Paper text:
KIF14 is a microtubule-based motor protein with essential roles during cell division. KIF14 belongs to the kinesin-3 family of motor proteins. As all kinesins, KIF14 possesses a highly conserved catalytic motor or head domain that contains nucleotide and microtubule binding sites, and where ATP hydrolysis is coupled to the generation of mechanical work.
The longer K772 construct includes a full neck-linker and the first coiled coil domain CC1. However, different from the MT-K743-ADP/Apo and MT-K748-ADP/Apo maps, the MT-K755-ADP/Apo and the MT-K772-ADP/Apo maps show a neck-linker associated density going sideways reaching the motor domain of an adjacent protofilament. Extra densities that could be associated with a partner motor domain in the dimeric K772 construct are not observed, suggesting that the partner head is not in a well-defined location. Because such density is not observed, the map is better fitted with a model in which the KIF14 dimer in the Apo and ADP states binds to the microtubule in a one-head-bound state. The dimeric K772 construct in the Apo and ADP states also provide a high-resolution view of the one-head microtubule-bound intermediate occurring during kinesins translocation when one kinesin motor domain changes binding sites along the microtubule.
Author numbering:
A (entry chain K): 392 to 750
B (entry chain B): 1 to 431
C (entry chain A): 1 to 441
The structure:
């Protein structure tokens, strides 16, 4: 495949410049290295892509708009060609994933560029011969239960109404009673997302406030309606396309972080989901390289949502944020270790004894 | 200290209880009066694994019955050990199902679940600690699947860490003692695979082959088969109850046998078993047992292992022994038939030992195995299904009480996917 | 004067104690209950030696030990069996839950609610110990509590007490045999947690003693106890220096020094040469030369580790009985003359020695037979690395296919811990692969 997991880095901060957190990550460009103040042991990690965004003037700079144009063309291509596409994000507090996905009002992130270029190509191609009808949904996962984020809550406690996941034989996984809305301006989805992020839950762990205890899924359906018949007005088909984005938590060592009660349950569920996702992605690259093999789809709930949006003619990717703080090193290392199994070379052997090239 | 609960539904579960508690009472030394008549000072040291206390130094099981039709529970009350149970724990109703799943999951099971919890919580909170829950049920019946599956769903929604074991029954290939075994058992297998740590899939016909060919009994009844299922359920927990040179529990078995969470459909076995007038010509030694176990004539599925492979096994021994012999035999077995076992797992077995065997034996062993021969049980089930759903044969019954075709399709999809997971590993799997 | 706290953990630890204390009581001539009828025969002195056993004004004694298993099926024997009224009633047996043959329960969910009590009792034992609290942990890999709980306890004691002698007579899996299927995952992380905090950690393998059971003492149907007694005689062959008078006495502070060149390579092996039967106790001299020859042979080693594939970083010895240091020197020089052995250039000395006059003592109806002298050996080699190098090939497949995993994180563990541990072990292999080269420049 071309799943093409990629990595980015946070230039430190002015606050971190006050403390002068010693640089740990060295970069040669294409490869990535790392050190440790013991200064004996060493690691070295490879990836398809490297966004060395720390330095401002170094060659091969990693710009936000450059991050967009790196991965945006396959999205619009694989969509307008009719197929579906997802995007996974991974990282934690200190890596500033929000800075990457959403950016700021002035500093444009990823989502806004995507939706705005989408609207651009929409209004550009909006002939009389075509209609583009796009709709939205936003939900979260919590202790392995689904909850709708978009719901305007009623007068009640916060019994976040648990929907369920069911299966059509035709298109497969979906949810009953999943609320949807419509998109005709970037500002509308901005407001929807701004409110949806509010109900997604965090908690003041030993680290800080906004350590999410849930996985946040964003889904867009696009309806492409161009089909027109020579005999008369008959739309013989209306193409559907699924675009997906998701933001996830870290990995949350409960060993050092001795937090008990209900936070442990949340962390355990999150870790199980992350495990299943890594296994799924391993099976993906194993399957698009010449070996038919099962997929452990049905283990989690999230993955059970995506068995069509992450298989067959579905080209997706993962992005990994980090920060080179000395007080983050383990977490930093852990992040990279979650992803590298998607490497193309995992020591595949060679065998060939078929010999009937005759006639 | 550790404690265990038992649930029963349908005719099979009640009738299996009437033999299992009738066996455990003689193992720990209890009588139909709920009273003690044993000899040691040991059988009463860990009896609290199952049983509660009393007033006149009697003892009581923490057993529960579910069944909707009283026409079976009465057979207990007019039974040998049918007046020890707390009569409140004989939860029942009326209006039997009709061998229907929908009438036991949706209409009345969904009605009666609260009344059953009214006893379940009472017995569960009395325990100082907890280890897990049991079930003893079957598929092809009514209440024995629907009400019990609903129970398991709710209970796991409550207790995400405690264990739930279901020593169930699955139907046979050749004879179908009930017509619509496939639909009911399929719905159960859907609502079980995600809501269970381990289930001990057991089949009728292997027991028949045993009682006809091996023990050379002439004419057995269902009692004489539940008399083996009970010993199967009993040698498992002997580690937990009685001491040993290497202890165990339910957790170590379920964890050292369920690598992947869905892949938890097991295959049992028992050793020693011989004809009444033929155990003169043998020896009660580990080699005889390990040779008699892995053969395809002591399991309980009638499902060909040599047609497949084993992911892992577990063997819980009972007696004065020498663990060196166990280890050497196990290494020899892994060495000889090594193709039958897996490449991508280096060692494929653990052990568990007790120094206290049953009342009349010197050496025993219970076998557990996570295999792939459970395939054909399920390919066959799905085939008998898709031969019926292809034309909506018996469907309108299950729908008229408020189902849809969508659920049936979901169950089929999940079964086929688990089947393909099992088929992932059956081939050579080399380089 | 000088004492040694002894903790035993897991069923392995508890059974090993059930052997070891039954040895120690017979050595000093001590009843089960705690009195000294041997002293009633003698009538005075320090013979009820305070290195292990504390004493009271009423006359009763008690060892300075504890044990914990998290499985009350085991020790409730010891609360009721023959040796019941000896030990301190504080044995922490909060075995509400078992350790599931997993390292997550032993170190985080079931690793709590006890460890505070354990350290509290270690304090309540130490403040009357008027010498070193040289710690002994008799734990095991594979087994549940003795991995995780031990990893927690030793790392905590490193912060509490620190500059002391902490030893682990751990138990290692045989490369083929097991009573488990996830034994490596429960064996590898305790190495990552011991490599910084424990000072020295001896090792054994059950398969090696199982092979001993038939070649030498002519038995083929052993229990576990018949190995626990070998372990007990090993520990006696160590402790008998501090315990009784001797010619060349050795303290536990010596073993940590003369066999730990580098901090991380502190994983030696152990042997006991005369393992011979009452019949075969006759028919032969048991002179010192042949004994010390058996103290380097491959068979009688307590581990499947062929040292001829590696080299010797160091070797220590502890002798017993009627012994002559000139005979010892002759044996040592005889052993240094062989081309079948390759000591490294940076350990030309090789040998440390220590002697105690009092030989071992027979135990009724057991296996071994009374003799006039005995020997124990310890050794830090470079061949054991291969055994560790086996586990990576017994690890990596499973962690690659991600088998037997989800039952860990269900109790709070992260997966990255594996990899961050894995390469650590890999680095350790390099150290055992690095020093074994006779450097020139
Ligand atoms: C002289 C002698 O050998 O007595 C045996 C006996 O004859 C045989 C046939 C027993 C007997 O079992 C059978 O032959 C049998 C009959 C019908 C259906 C299935 C089996 C026995 O019932 C089995 C029983 O041993 C037991 O299994 C335990 O007592 C058993 N408890 C009960 O079954 C029980 C049932 C109702 C009321 C009270 C006790 C048990 C087994 C495992 C775990 C816990 C308990 C004993 C001594 C015998 C008889 C009685 C003939 C054997 O039983 C087993 C599997 O252990 C069959 O082979 C063994 C040993 C003997 O060969
Ligand atoms: N050499 C030796 N090894 C032993 C002995 N007893 C137990 N073991 C090993 O210890 C392992 C299990 O130890 P435990 O931790 O006590 O297992 P457990 O009794 O279930 O206790 P937990 O695992 O902590 O729950 C087994 O696999 C054995 O290989 C012994 O007496 N001698
Ligand atoms: N193996 C076994 N199966 C039984 C026994 N009693 C009943 N059954 C099973 O029960 C099924 C019949 O359905 P049943 O459970 O009686 O329906 P219900 O009780 O009304 O829910 C059959 O498949 C039988 O195999 C028994 O003693 N042994
Ligand atoms: Mg245990």
């Amino acid at each position: 495949s071309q799943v093409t997991v990629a990595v980015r880095v946070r230039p430190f901060s002015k606050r971190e410049k006050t403390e002068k957190a010693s640089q740990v990550v060295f970069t040669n460009g294409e490869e990535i290295t790392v050190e440790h103040p013991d200064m004996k042991q060493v690691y070295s990690f490879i990836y398809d892509v490297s966004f060395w965004s720390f330095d401002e003037c170094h060659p091969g700079y990693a710009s936000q708009t450059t991050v967009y144009e790196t991965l945006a063309a396959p999205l619009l291509d694989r969509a307008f060609e009719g197929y579906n596409t997802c995007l996974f994000a991974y990282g934690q507090t200190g890596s500033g994933k929000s800075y990457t996905m959403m950016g700021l009002n002035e500093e444009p992130g990823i989502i806004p560029r995507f939706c705005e270029d989408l609207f651009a190509q929409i209004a550009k191609k909006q002939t009389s011969e075509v209609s583009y009808h796009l709709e939205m949904s936003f939900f979260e996962v919590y202790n392995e239960k689904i909850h709708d984020l978009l719901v305007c809550k009623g007068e009640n406690g916060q019994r976040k109404q648990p929907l369920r996941a069911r299966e059509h034989p035709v298109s497969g996984p979906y949810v009953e009673g999943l609320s949807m809305n419509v998109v005709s301006s970037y500002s509308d989805i901005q407001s929807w997302l701004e409110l949806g992020n509010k109900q997604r839950a965090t908690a003041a762990t030993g680290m800080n406030d906004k350590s999410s205890r849930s996985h946040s899924v964003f889904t867009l359906v696009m309806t492409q309606t161009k089909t027109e018949v020579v005999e008369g007005e008959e739309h013989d088909h209306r193409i559907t396309s699924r675009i997906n984005l998701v933001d996830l938590a870290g990995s949350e060592r409960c060993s050092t972080a001795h937090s008990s009660g209900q936070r442990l349950k949340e962390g355990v569920s999150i870790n199980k989901s992350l495990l299943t996702l890594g296994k799924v992605i391993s099976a993906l690259s194993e399957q698009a390289n010449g070996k038919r093999v099962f997929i452990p789809y049905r283990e989690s709930t999230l993955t059970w949502l995506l068995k069509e949006s992450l298989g067959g003619n579905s080209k997706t990717a993962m992005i990994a944020t980090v920060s080179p703080a000395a007080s983050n090193i383990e977490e930093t290392l852990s992040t990279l270790r979650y992803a590298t199994q998607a490497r193309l070379i995992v020591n595949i052997a060679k065998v060939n004894e078929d010999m009937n090239a005759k006639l | 200290m550790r404690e265990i609960v038992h649930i029963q539904a349908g005719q099979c579960g009640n009738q299996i209880g009437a033999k299992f508690w009738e066996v455990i009472s003689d193992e720990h030394g209890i009588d139909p009066t709920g009273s003690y008549h044993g000899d040691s000072d040991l059988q009463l040291e860990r009896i609290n694994v199952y049983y509660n206390e009393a007033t006149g130094n009697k003892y009581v099981p923490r057993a529960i019955l579910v069944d909707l039709e009283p026409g079976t529970m009465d057979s207990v009350r007019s039974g040998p050990f049918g007046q020890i149970f707390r009569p409140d724990n004989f939860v029942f109703g009326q209006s039997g199902a009709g061998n229907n799943w929908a009438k036991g999951h949706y209409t009345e099971g969904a009605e009666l679940v609260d009344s059953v919890l009214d006893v379940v919580r009472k017995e569960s909170e009395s325990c100082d600690c907890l280890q897990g829950f049991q079930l003893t049920h079957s598929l092809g019946g009514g209440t024995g699947s629907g009400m019990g599956t609903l129970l398991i769903s709710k209970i796991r929604e409550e207790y995400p860490d405690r264990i739930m074991n279901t020593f169930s029954v699955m139907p046979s290939p050749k004879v179908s003692d009930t017509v619509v075994e496939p639909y009911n058992a399929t719905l159960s297998v859907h609502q079980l695979v995600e809501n269970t740590d381990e289930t001990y899939c057991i089949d009728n016909e292997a027991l028949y082959d045993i009682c006809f060919r091996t023990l050379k009994l002439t004419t057995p009844t269902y009692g004489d088969l539940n008399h083996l299922v009970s010993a199967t359920m009993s040698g498992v927990t002997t580690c937990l109850r009685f001491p040993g040179q290497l202890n165990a529990d339910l957790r170590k078995l379920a964890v050292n046998m369920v690598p992947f969470p869905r892949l938890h459909f097991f295959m049992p076995g028992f050793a020693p078993l011989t004809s009444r007038g033929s155990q003169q010509y043998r020896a009660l030694t580990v080699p005889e047992l390990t040779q008699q176990m892995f053969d395809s004539k002591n399991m309980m599925a009638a499902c060909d292992p040599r047609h497949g492979r084993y992911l892992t096994v577990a063997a819980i021994f009972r007696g004065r022994m020498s663990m060196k012999e166990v280890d050497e035999q196990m290494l020899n077995v892994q060495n000889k038939n090594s193709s039958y076992f897996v490449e991508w797992i280096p060692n494929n077995v653990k052990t568990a030992v007790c120094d206290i065997p049953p009342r009349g034996l010197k050496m025993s062993a219970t076998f557990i195995g996570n295999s792939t021969a459970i395939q054909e049980l399920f390919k066959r089930i799905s085939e008998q299904f898709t031969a019926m759903f292809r034309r909506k044969a018996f469907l309108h019954w299950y729908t008229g009480e408020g189902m849809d075709e969508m659920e049936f399709t979901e169950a089929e999809s999940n079964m086929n996917d688990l089947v393909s997971e099992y088929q992932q590993y059956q081939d050579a799997t080399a380089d | 004067m000088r004492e040694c706290i002894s903790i035993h953990v897991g069923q392995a630890g508890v059974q090993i104690g059930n052997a070891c204390w039954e040895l120690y009581c017979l050595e000093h001539g001590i009843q089960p209950d705690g009195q000294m009828p041997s002293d009633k025969t003698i009538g005075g002195g320090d013979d009820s030696f305070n290195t292990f056993f504390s004493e009271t004004g009423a006359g009763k004694h008690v060892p300075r030990a504890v044990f914990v298993d998290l499985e009350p099926t085991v020790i409730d024997e010891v609360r009721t069996g023959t040796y019941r009224q000896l030990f301190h009633p504080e044995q922490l047996i909060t075995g509400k839950e078992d350790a599931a043959n997993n390292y997550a329960r032993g170190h985080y969910t079931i690793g709590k609610e006890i460890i505070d009590l354990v350290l509290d009792r270690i304090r309540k034992l130490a403040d009357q110990c008027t010498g070193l609290q040289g710690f002994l942990v008799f734990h095991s890999f594979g087994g549940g509590t003795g991995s995780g709980f031990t990893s927690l306890l030793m790392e905590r004691l490193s912060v509490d007490y620190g500059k002391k002698s902490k030893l682990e007579f751990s138990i290692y899996p045989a490369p083929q045999v097991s009573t488990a299927v996830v034994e490596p995952y429960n064996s590898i992380l305790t190495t990552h947690t011991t490599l910084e905090h424990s000072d020295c950690a001896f090792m054994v393998d059950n398969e090696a003693i199982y092979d001993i059971c038939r070649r030498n003492l002519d038995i083929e149907r052993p229990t576990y106890t018949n190995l626990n007694r070998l372990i007990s005689q090993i520990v006696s062959s160590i402790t008998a220096s501090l315990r009784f008078d001797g010619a060349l006495n050795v303290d536990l502070t010596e073993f940590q020094t003369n066999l730990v060149p580098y901090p991380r390579i502190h994983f030696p092996l152990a042997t006991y040469a005369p393992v011979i039967s009452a019949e075969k106790a006759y028919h032969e001299q048991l002179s010192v030369a042949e004994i010390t020859n058996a103290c380097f042979e491959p068979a009688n080693q307590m581990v499947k580790c062929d040292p001829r594939h590696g080299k010797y970083m160091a070797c220590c010895l502890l002798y017993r009985g009627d012994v002559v240091p000139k005979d010892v020197n002759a044996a040592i020089a005889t052993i240094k003359t062989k081309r079948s052995i390759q000591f490294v250039d940076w350990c030309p000395t090789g040998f440390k020695v220590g002697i105690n006059y009092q030989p071992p003592t027979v135990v009724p109806g057991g296996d071994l037979a009374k003799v006039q002298r005995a020997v124990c050996m310890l050794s830090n080699t470079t061949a054991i690395a291969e055994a560790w190098a086996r586990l990576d090939h017994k690890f990596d497949l499973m962690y690659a296919k991600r088998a037997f995993v989800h039952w860990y994180v269900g109790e709070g563990m992260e997966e990255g811990e594996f990899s961050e541990a894995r390469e650590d072990m890999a680095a350790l292999e390099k150290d055992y692969e690095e020093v074994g080269v006779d450097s020139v420049e």
